[PDB]
Amino acid sequence: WELQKENSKRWNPEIQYTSNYYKSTSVDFAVNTEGVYSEPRPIGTRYLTRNL
Amino acid sequence: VKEVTQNEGTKTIANNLTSTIQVFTDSEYQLPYVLGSAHQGCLPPFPADVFMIPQYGYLTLNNGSQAVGRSSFYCLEYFPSQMLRTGNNFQFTYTFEDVPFHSS
Amino acid sequence: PLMGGFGLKHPPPQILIKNTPVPADPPTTFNQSKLNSFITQYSTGQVSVEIE
Amino acid sequence: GADGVGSSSGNWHCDSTWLGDRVITTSTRTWALPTYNNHLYKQISNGTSGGATNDNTYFGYSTPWGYFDFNRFHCHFSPRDWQRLINNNWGFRPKRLSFKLFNIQVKEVTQNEGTKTIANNLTSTIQVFTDSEYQLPYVLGSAHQGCLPPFPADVFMIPQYGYLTLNNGSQAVGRSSFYCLEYFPSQMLRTGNNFQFTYTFEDVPFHSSYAHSQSLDRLMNPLIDQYLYYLSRTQTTGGTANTQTLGFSQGGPNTMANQAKNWLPGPCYRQQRVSTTTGQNNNSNFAWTAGTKYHLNGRNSLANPGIAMATHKDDEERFFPSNGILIFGKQNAARDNADYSDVMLTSEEEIKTTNPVATEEYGIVADNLQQQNTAPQIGTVNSQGALPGMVWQNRDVYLQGPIWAKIPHTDGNFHPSPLMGGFGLKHPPPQILIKNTPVPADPPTTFNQSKLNSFITQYSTGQVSVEIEWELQKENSKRWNPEIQYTSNYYKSTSVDFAVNTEGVYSEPRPIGTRYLTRNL
Amino acid sequence: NWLPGPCYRQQRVSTTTGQNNNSNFAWTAGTKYHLNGRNSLANPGIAMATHK
Amino acid sequence: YAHSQSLDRLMNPLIDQYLYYLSRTQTTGGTANTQTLGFSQGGPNTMANQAKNWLPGPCYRQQRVSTTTGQNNNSNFAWTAGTKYHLNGRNSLANPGIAMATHK
Amino acid sequence: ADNLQQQNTAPQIGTVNSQGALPGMVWQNRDVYLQGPIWAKIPHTDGNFHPS
Amino acid sequence: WELQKENSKRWNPEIQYTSNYYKSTSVDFAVNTEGVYSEPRPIGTRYLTRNL
């Protein structure tokens, strides 16, 4: 996969995609009790910001 | 560069030599591009005129009068910019991309 | 462009300019707060533009 | 070209750059230097003769000079960059820095009647020098106010330089030392000059930014038993008459607390716990009495903050040690007696793995010696020194936090990691000094020997630019699931974080820790 | 000119049953260290003389 | 050589720190006082509250003895009260012991 | 501090007469004297700490 | 300034010029409260000893 790097002068912190900090019964994107892999949520591709 | 004061009800003006001004151009288009809305304040047609330079500003994503997370903020002093005193000049060149001849 | 003109991928770069803020007399005793006082100031000059 | 009043000395540089593992961030600010102490070195002291308590007695001098302090991060990093850095990088260290000083102006101001006026004085000069040989009392490292402002548009006043020396009471002893700054070679600049120098950092270990995905004690295999045994039973059971006996078992999944272990937690020096909930705390003022303190030279001292420790254990976040944690005030917080809502508290929770909780004991040992006659007893160690096989984590660094501190020059030290966090150095960046050149008033016609006390009121401003090249340590990890990251809030707000308010007062809504990515013990 | 190594005390237990206290003290009297709100026995602990 | 400074006084006497410490656990000036939280910056007035980057060396206490006879306790405590360390079921006086200040 | 404070409980303090080495300590060796011994042989051991 | 170094076999300790050890209200040869520099005493040039 070829990439296009981000070059931006925006001052404030960006929005990012992170995992939840708070505790859980099981980890996201990890096997359950029985080893059935599952994805708790879909993931969009758009986070960083540009300028029209 | 000229520094002006108000003393009592009178004004006076004098040349301040050492003072400087800042100039830069964004070649990489890294700023909100405010031109293209045909705002007032272009260079006056009749050359003998002397014009005031407009103030720069920009708008961003709003919800009501409030602003959301993707709202972006800038600091202009965060760019490389050349500093000039009274003994300086500033010049640059540019080229237009190939664009079809405007039909008249 | 609707208003008519030449649309561009890369317009001529917009130019920025500002007077350098020059403080007034600061106090003798130190303070951290940034200096809000300034010499009232403005500047003029010439500008020339060429197009082929 | 030939420099003079016409040309400008140097060009504004505030920029960052990301190259591979290198990141180069340079900044520029506008400074203003007033004249201090009317050009007079003055003795300053305080003692129990006045209202001072015995602990705060000091003796020292206040020089006319002034110095530059960039030691805080938020000088060199926009929040945005400081977002990239902590997300993608395990560790980093500085390499080399550059410094430039240019575009000096000098302005002489007068008071006539009830009015003021200002004009450019061309011929006047200012003095600048840097101590490369560290021959002066090194005042940086205490995180004093007056570093370069984070938001570049600001214009800051340069602090006044001074230092303290051996005191006895408000008085001073024989080893008390005195200095004269004008006694050093220093370069003199007029409006047509610039000043620049370079520096290199000594090899210093990369500051670790990450949390350990494991815990110190749980490194074991959960499935498999150990073959070692421990003493599991001192007494027969199930009988109507029970006697002492010896019995053992293998360490295994069921009971992990009995298994052998290869390492120990870091050292612990206890702190008193304080709740953010007012009602929970004791009703009294215990702060200075109950405060954890250390005693030096017949003089009491609070230990601020103290060594790196866990702030709190699980879900205890409302609890924090007395002086154990750093504090940062919110914008325009009251200087004195500020209420909680105006300050911002750091959290060390990330290190709970390796290091003990600050509010609790290190461990338990036996006080007495058991016998068939005697009942055994236990004891509690609140303060534990260093032992073989300990591992520990340094204290975190913050966007507002100080970058480095000079390691004192001594016979010997142990693990020189500055308490406030940073990079300890044998040879920090040399501190920079600056002063206006005193210009006399009109002297009398008739001769006199007495030095001239009268002067032209004067001050001078200019530009300053600073460059730092930060080396990085890239993150390489096979962890499957998504990481924790540092992000801005998605939900709407009245104003944006880290952006100017209605009146253009820049403010930082929260401090930013350095540790997000995870590694493996 | 020198000092012995560091010491973190342990409770003494006799191989002779009768000599030992009559009780089960093993986990209560056991020398332990506390980490992350979690108690841990120190096994074995740092190197020391077994007995004089 | 001797250090012209002291470990704790390395601070600038003039300038405040920007850190805060917990200065107040209790309301004051009222007829009814309750617990509260309050802070202040470390500054010239109170230096004992300021942040510090280093700690004194290790300490293993000794018993104090006066050169003035009358001041000392009347007894022979030398070997009993003497600071000692225990090795291999054998008692040992620690002579002299690690480097420390003799007296304040 | 020896104990843990509460709205119910009064805090207490404790005194450390003997303190081991901690991170960030600095210290000075003992002085030498015109009559004093010049050197001493470091014992040969698994390991030592600041052999002065 | 050119110097002439001292070469002498005298056994006992020399007389030297030293600052007073005992405490003072202010330091010798340092600025006073008001920044008026002063010299508490003159200093002779002759200390070391030679032999006729």
Per DSSP, the residues of B18-75 read S--EEEEE-SS--S---TTS--S----SSTT---PPPPP-----EETTEE-TT-----
Say if residues D79 and D99 touch (Cβ distance below 8 Å): no
Three-state secondary structure string covering D501-518: CCCCCCCCCCCCECCCCE
Closest residue to D120, CB basis, from B7, B18, B66: B18
DSSP strands (E only) in D207-266? 207-208, 211-212, 229-235, 244-250
Closest among F24, F12, F32, F52 to D334, alpha carbons compared:
F24
Per the CB < 8 Å rule, is E36 touching D352?
yes
The coordinates were experimentally obtained by cryo-EM
Closest among D361, D423, D362, D365 to D394, alpha carbons compared:
D423
**Rounded Cα–Cα distance for residues E1 and G36 (Å):** 13
- Say whether the E–B interface has 3 or more Cβ pairs within 8 Å: no
Return the structure tokens found at F54.
């280093």
To which H or E segment does residue D111 belong?
strand D89-112
Per the CB < 8 Å rule, is F85 touching E3?
yes
Identify residues after which chain A is interrupted (C–N over 2.5 A): none
DSSP strands (E only) in chain F? 20-26, 35-41, 59-60, 84-87, 90-93
Which residues make Cβ contacts (< 8 Å) with residue G25, sequence separation at least 6? Answer: D413, D414, F54, F55, F56, F57, F58
Establish how many alpha carbons lie within 13 A of residue D383's alpha carbon, considering only the half-sphere containing its beta carbon. Answer: 22
Distances (CA, A) of C5 to B24, B33, C2, D455: 26, 16, 8, 64
Identify residues after which chain D is interrupted (C–N over 2.5 A): none
Per the CB < 8 Å rule, is F99 touching G19?
no
* Region of residue B78 (phi > 0: left; psi between -120 and 50: alpha; otherwise: beta): alpha
Per the CB < 8 Å rule, is E12 touching D375?
no
To which H or E segment does residue D467 belong?
strand D458-474
Taking the CB of residue F67, how many other CB atoms lie within 10 A of it? Answer: 6
**Rounded Cα–Cα distance for residues C18 and B1 (Å):** 12
Say if residues D247 and D229 touch (Cβ distance below 8 Å): no
Say if residues F68 and D309 touch (Cβ distance below 8 Å): no
List residues of D whose CB lies inside 8 A of any G CB.
266-267, 269-274, 279-284, 286, 289-290, 292, 307-308, 359, 382-388, 392, 394, 408, 410-419
Probe site for chain D from E31, E33, E38, E50 (most D CB atoms < 10 A): E33
Say if residues D437 and D216 touch (Cβ distance below 8 Å): no
Per the CB < 8 Å rule, is H24 touching D178?
no
Closest residue to H22, CB basis, from D42, D43, D174: D174
Per the CB < 8 Å rule, is D483 touching A19?
yes
**Rounded Cα–Cα distance for residues D79 and D510 (Å):** 11
Partners of chain H (3+ Cβ pairs below 8 A): D
Per the CB < 8 Å rule, is D386 touching G19?
no
The residue of chain D nearest to residue B23, with distances taken between CA atoms, is D12
Per the CB < 8 Å rule, is G40 touching E1?
yes
Which residues make Cβ contacts (< 8 Å) with residue D171, sequence separation at least 6? Answer: D45, D47, D59, H23, H24, H25
Closest residue to C6, CB basis, from B24, B26, B99: B99
| Residues from chain G contacting residue F98 (CB–CB below 8 Å) | 30
To which H or E segment does residue D75 belong?
helix D73-76
DSSP secondary structure string, C1-52? -TTSS---SS-PPPEEEEEPP-B-PPPSS---SPP--B--EE----------
Partners of chain D (3+ Cβ pairs below 8 A): A, B, C, E, F, G, H
> Residue D462, annotated ligand binder?
no
Quote the minimal CA–CA distance from F42 to chain C in Å: 14
Taking the CB of residue D452, how many other CB atoms lie within 10 A of it? Answer: 13
Probe site for chain C from B24, B42, B88, B93 (most C CB atoms < 10 A): B24
Q: Are strands D299-302 and D404-406 parallel, antiparallel or unpaired?
A: unpaired
| Residues from chain C contacting residue F14 (CB–CB below 8 Å) | 30
| Residues from chain F contacting residue C27 (CB–CB below 8 Å) | none
User: How many beta-carbon contacts under 8 Å exist across D and F?
Assistant: 190
Bridge-partner residues for D191, per DSSP? none
List residues of A whose CB lies inside 8 A of any D CB.
8-19, 21, 27-30
Closest residue to C16, CB basis, from B19, B23, B29: B23
| Residues from chain A contacting residue D82 (CB–CB below 8 Å) | 13
Bridge-partner residues for D152, per DSSP? none
Return the structure tokens found at B93.
């060149």
**Residue D62, Cβ density class (10 Å: 0-12 exposed, 13-18 middle, ≥19 buried):** buried
List residues of F whose CB lies inside 8 A of any E CB.
85, 87-89, 94, 98
Quote the minimal CA–CA distance from G37 to chain E in Å: 11
Omega cis (within 30) before D79? no
Establish how many alpha carbons lie within 13 A of residue D372's alpha carbon, considering only the half-sphere containing its beta carbon. Answer: 10
**Rounded Cα–Cα distance for residues C46 and D205 (Å):** 54
The residue of chain D nearest to residue F42, with distances taken between CA atoms, is D144
Partners of chain B (3+ Cβ pairs below 8 A): A, C, D
**Rounded Cα–Cα distance for residues H52 and H30 (Å):** 39
Per the CB < 8 Å rule, is D157 touching C25?
no
Say if residues D512 and D82 touch (Cβ distance below 8 Å): yes
Closest residue to H25, CB basis, from D41, D42, D171: D171
Bridge-partner residues for D405, per DSSP? D424
Omega cis (within 30) before G11? no
Taking the CB of residue F61, how many other CB atoms lie within 10 A of it? Answer: 13
| Residues from chain A contacting residue B28 (CB–CB below 8 Å) | 7
Q: Which residue has the tokens 């020396």?
A: D165
Taking the CB of residue C28, how many other CB atoms lie within 10 A of it? Answer: 13
Say if residues E8 and E46 touch (Cβ distance below 8 Å): yes
Per the CB < 8 Å rule, is D482 touching A27?
no
| Residues from chain D contacting residue E26 (CB–CB below 8 Å) | 231-234
Q: Given in angstroms, what resolution was this structure solved at?
A: 3.8
Quote the minimal CA–CA distance from G19 to chain D in Å: 6
3-state SS assignment for residue H24: strand
Say if residues D467 and D24 touch (Cβ distance below 8 Å): yes
